[PDB]
Enzyme design. Structure first.
Site, PDB file in Angstrom:
ATOM      1  N   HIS A 112       0.811  -1.208   0.000  1.00  0.00           N
ATOM      2  CA  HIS A 112       0.000   0.000   0.000  1.00  0.00           C
ATOM      3  C   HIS A 112       0.848   1.263   0.000  1.00  0.00           C
ATOM      4  CE1 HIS A 112       0.554   0.148   4.463  1.00  0.00           C
ATOM      5  NE2 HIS A 112       0.353   1.441   4.280  1.00  0.00           N
ATOM      6  N   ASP A 167       1.840  -7.501   2.817  1.00  0.00           N
ATOM      7  CA  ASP A 167       1.849  -6.094   2.426  1.00  0.00           C
ATOM      8  C   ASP A 167       3.284  -5.635   2.165  1.00  0.00           C
ATOM      9  OD1 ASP A 167       1.163  -3.461   1.945  1.00  0.00           O
ATOM     10  OD2 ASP A 167      -0.115  -3.282   3.720  1.00  0.00           O
ATOM     11  N   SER A 197       4.559   2.859   7.956  1.00  0.00           N
ATOM     12  CA  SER A 197       4.396   1.807   6.965  1.00  0.00           C
ATOM     13  C   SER A 197       5.689   1.537   6.231  1.00  0.00           C
ATOM     14  CB  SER A 197       3.299   2.163   5.978  1.00  0.00           C
ATOM     15  OG  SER A 197       2.054   1.792   6.496  1.00  0.00           O
TER      16      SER A 197
END
Length: 695
Positions: free
Chosen positions: A65, A207, A626
């Site tokens: 993402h 991810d 992230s």
């Protein structure tokens, strides 16, 4: 042992505690203020994520993402990298990206004394320059001195305020803008469970995505050029196949964006009742329309996949935040903390801290009408309706062939490859209907009165008429205008009159609200200073501000409620348990299933023979973390941070040890997917992979 998002300067004060938690690295190999360290393998990824270098040829890992925008930007129906992933089989096939960046943090210096010296010399205590990025940049340039970036190319200098203005750090940053997409799994891996599993543990999402930094032949920053070569970095992460056990030490470096841990009780109320609630209601409307359009047309899906994810992530985060505020009594916790300070200050004989808390409360109470109107229009229209950003003819242009080209330019960017006028109309009608029902007539942007005035409540007809009669309502209608451009035609254009009216109101609310920001900000400086004095700064850390921080803890599950425990690790078996071919969120790639069914795990399986997917840890992370490297006790890479559990969303207000977990994709699962799903052997050959003792 303490939880938190610690400044790199605080590694010295925490190093002994981290050893007692299990750390085995020597301190200056983790972060060295005057030399090379593992910190130099960490990068701020595209201004909003973290990443890490994992190769002597500049290979960067981050989240799927985090790379979503560039995966989508490179996707077509012919090559749908969003759907099927992407795997460059040689470096020449790695895809360049427009307007992307990777930033290394070369040096960090405490310049608080210098900044305070310069501020007091201005002799203007009420000025807000102590927070102004433009003024701090002037102070930064003064320190770095004499055309700093011109002399040192690709290097820059930045000063940032911490603790509401009580601490200043100068950052020497090295920025690379040639960052190319190397590999990405299919979204069924990188986004498994989509919105349903977003902010949820147990998590079964792989991810990750893979990039490579390109530089000039000396390793220095350079714009995109087919002559650039992969960067040979100062340092990169060794990848560990040793796995993770429950209670293992784990630590993270990254760029947490924003926390609100010094909120007063009344600020928590405002955040929940204005900011979060308006975001929740507006975005659920925009998203419901958008998703129905996305699932019906594969090209609408490509065009809006990134737009939808950016809207969906903060929407669900706002739900989780308000849930923590409600069920964990976060408002009353802040009430207690500010009352503690007020009582302490009364003893010391100063009312400055009681005055500051009251000053915040009064300003918050006063700006509630406008702030509510500001967030209704920002979420409802500025964010929600794309043709609010349709071109507006400048005053220069209307008072005039050359100008029709600048307007074509802005029509181009507005109605770009990602823009569906049919999708936007369906969205606009749904959004304006909620907007018109919540904002009274006398408070609407001027053009929006025509729904009541001219269209008798018909919202559909109002939007329909905007596109029907506007120069920008379609490509054909713009060409007809670019051919014989009027000015009495554009000066009454319905879409132009819409975009200018809503943006007029947006700025009127801003200019009205922005003065209320300053008394809060000054009170915040006093409130935070009193808490630092009352309780010392050994166990306090400044709110996140998109600067480099470290956090440590243990690999550990949690219990969300009575008699329910979630363990510390998920497996590929959990992916297959969740597979539903009739649910777009939970479809599974047949390549992944074949690997699971045949147990074709290689050396990536746990020693037990089971295949890990993700694990969680008591580290304290937030948005911006992230893609952050997750290190074991030897500093070797064991995973990439990518999310928080549901209860963890409340960590931006208060960390609670029984509930705060970072969700982390296991590095062995990353390698399995690269190897057995992507088939890109060359990327593991260039990594330095550390076997387990039992290999």
């Amino acid at each position: 042992m303490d939880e938190g998002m610690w400044l790199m300067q605080q590694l010295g004060r925490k190093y002994a505690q981290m050893k007692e938690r299990g750390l085995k690295m020597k301190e200056y190999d983790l972060y060295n203020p005057n030399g090379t360290s593992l910190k130099d393998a960490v990068v701020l990824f595209d201004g909003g994520c973290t990443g890490e270098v994992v190769s002597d040829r500049g290979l960067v890992l981050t989240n799927h993402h985090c790379g979503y925008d560039m995966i989508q930007a490179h996707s077509t129906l012919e090559h749908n990298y969003l759907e099927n992933g992407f795997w460059a089989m040689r470096e020449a096939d790695e895809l360049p990206n427009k307007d992307i960046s990777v930033v290394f943090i070369d040096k960090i210096e405490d310049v608080t004394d210098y900044v305070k010296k310069e501020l007091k010399a201005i002799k203007d205590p009420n000025s807000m320059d102590y927070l102004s990025p433009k003024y701090l940049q002037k102070l930064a340039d003064k320190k770095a001195g004499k055309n700093f970036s011109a002399k040192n190319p690709g290097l820059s200098v930045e000063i940032k305020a911490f603790y509401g203005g009580n601490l200043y750090l100068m950052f020497t940053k090295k920025t690379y803008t040639d960052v190319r997409l190397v590999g990405a799994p299919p979204s069924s891996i990188g986004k498994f469970g989509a919105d349903t599993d977003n902010w949820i543990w147990p998590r079964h999402t792989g991810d990750f995505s893979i990039f490579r930094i390109y530089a000039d032949k000396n390793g220095n920053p350079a714009p995109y050029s087919e002559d650039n070569v992969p960067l040979k970095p100062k340092r990169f992460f060794n990848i560990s196949l040793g796995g993770v056990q429950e209670n293992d030490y784990a630590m993270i470096m990254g760029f947490p964006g924003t926390t609100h841990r010094y909120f007063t009780a009344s600020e928590v109320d405002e955040w929940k009742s204005i900011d979060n609630d308006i975001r929740i209601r507006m975005r659920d409307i925009r998203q419901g329309v958008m998703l129905r359009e996305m699932l019906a047309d594969p090209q609408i899906k490509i065009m809006y996949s990134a737009k939808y994810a950016a809207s969906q992530n903060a929407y669900k985060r706002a739900i989780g935040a308000n849930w923590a505020i409600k069920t964990r009594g976060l408002r009353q916790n802040k009430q207690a903390m500010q009352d503690r300070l007020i009582a302490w200050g009364a003893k010391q004989g100063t009312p400055r801290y009681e005055e500051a808390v009251h000053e915040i409360d009064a300003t918050v109470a006063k700006r509630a009408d406008l702030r509510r109107r500001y967030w209704m229009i920002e979420e409802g229209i500025i964010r929600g309706i794309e043709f609010a950003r349709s071109p507006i003819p400048t005053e220069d242009e209307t008072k005039a062939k050359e100008a029709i080209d600048k307007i074509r330019t802005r029509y181009s960017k507005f109605a770009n490859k990602d823009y569906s006028a049919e999708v936007d109309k369906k969205v606009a009608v749904a959004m304006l209907t909620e907007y018109l029902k919540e904002i009274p007539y006398e408070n609407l942007p001027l053009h929006l009165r025509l729904v009541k005035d001219r269209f008798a409540g018909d919202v559909q007809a109002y939007v329909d008429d905007i596109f029907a009669r506007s120069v920008f309502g379609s490509e054909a209608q713009f060409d007809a205008f670019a051919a014989v451009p009027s000015v009495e035609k554009l000066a009454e254009d319905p879409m132009v009159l819409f975009a200018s009216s809503v943006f007029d109101e947006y700025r009127k609310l801003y200019n009205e609200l922005r003065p209320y920001d300053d008394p809060i900000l000054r009170a915040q400086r006093t409130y935070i200073a009193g808490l630092l004095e009352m309780d010392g700064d050994q166990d306090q850390f400044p709110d996140a501000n998109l600067t480099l921080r470290f956090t440590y803890g243990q690999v550990k599950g949690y219990s969300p409620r009575d008699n329910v425990y979630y363990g510390h690790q998920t497996t590929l078996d959990g992916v297959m348990e969740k597979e539903d071919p009739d649910n777009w969120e939970f479809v599974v790639d047949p390549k992944l299933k074949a690997v699971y069914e045949r147990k074709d795990f290689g050396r990536y399986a746990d020693r037990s023979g089971r295949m890990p997917v993700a694990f969680c840890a008591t580290t304290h992370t937030t948005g911006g973390n992230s893609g952050s490297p997750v290190m074991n006790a030897n500093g070797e890479l064991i995973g990439l941070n990518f999310d928080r559990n549901w209860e963890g969303v409340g960590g931006d207000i208060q960390y609670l040890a029984d509930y705060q977990r970072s969700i982390i994709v296991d590095i062995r699962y990353v390698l399995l997917v690269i190897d057995k799903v992507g088939g890109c052997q060359r990327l593991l050959d260039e990594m330095n992979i550390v076997p387990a003792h039992h290999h």
